[PDB]
Amino acid sequence: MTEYKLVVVGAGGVGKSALTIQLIQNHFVDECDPTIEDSYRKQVVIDGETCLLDILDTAGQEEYSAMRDQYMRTGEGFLCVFAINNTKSFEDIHQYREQIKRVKDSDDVPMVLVGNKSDLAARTVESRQAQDLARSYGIPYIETSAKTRQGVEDAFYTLVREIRQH
Ligand SMILES: Nc1nc2c(ncn2[C@@H]2O[C@H](COP(=O)(O)OP(=O)(O)OP(=O)(O)O)[C@@H](O)[C@H]2O)c(=O)[nH]1
Ligand SMILES: *CC(=O)N(C)CCN(C)c1ccc([N+](=O)[O-])c2nonc12
Ligand SMILES: [Mg+2]
Ligand SMILES: [Mg+2]
């Protein structure tokens, strides 16, 4: 079957697991769990194509490492998540982008930028600037909430469309 190898990357606590679980299982998580690596697999339909998603939900570390590389290098497409009320997580996106490019040894890797927690008010990252970030990178930008599920299919399905198009 047509599989898409996705990887969910970004700083600790931005909602990587909540996004993924909301997509695998259609409910919201909210518990104290210092993720590590855990992969999900579900057969879904995207634009009339039956396919499998194989999703690696990474740990939010503050140290790079070979082990993380060992996990990441399997991926085809990367969902780069920050939280819109966490400015440091937004600044980190540059380091992930760089990290992903080096790990895949390529200049153009399928990638989408996600700004999660859209249900929360008093944002600290304006949409305009994140959109501008993605555009300066030449990639799509999607906003999302693991809580309300708004945008969550759009973010993951836009990444598969980036995988198909590279
Ligand atoms: N309100 C709201 N809370 C969210 C959202 N996404 C995640 N959270 C909460 O934010 C916290 C962190 O979510 P996680 O999914 O554990 O974050 P993570 O990126 O996997 O963190 P690490 O695994 O440690 O790297 C939890 O309390 C979640 O319930 C969201 O869209 N809205
Ligand atoms: C639920 C949980 O995270 N713990 C029991 C770990 C210990 N606590 C309470 C903890 C760890 C790390 C950080 N942090 O640096 O982000 C915490 N911030 O508030 N409590 C933290
Ligand atoms: Mg997690
Ligand atoms: Mg590209």
Q: Where are the domains of the chain?
A: 1-166
Contact present, 90 and 125 (Cβ < 8 Å): yes
Beta bridge partners of 43: 52
Output b/e per residue, 153-162; b: 16+ Cβ within 10 A.
eebbbbbbbb
Taking a C-beta distance cutoff of 8 angstroms, is the pair 95, 60 a contact?
no
How is 7-43 classified by DSSP, letter by letter?
EEE-STTSSHHHHHHHHHHSS----------EEEEEE
Please name the residue whose Cα sits nearest to atom 30 of ligand 1.
117
Q: Which amino acid is at 68?
A: R
User: Is 160 close to ligand 1, i.e. is its CB under 6 Å away?
Assistant: no
* Protein residue with its CA nearest to atom 18 in ligand 1: 13
- Element containing residue 55 per DSSP (H, E): strand 49-57
Q: Which helix (H) or strand (E) holds 161?
A: helix 152-165
- Nearest Cα residue to atom 7 of ligand 1: 15
Q: Which CATH architecture has domain 1-166?
A: 3-Layer(aba) Sandwich (3.40)
Three-class SS state of 159:
helix
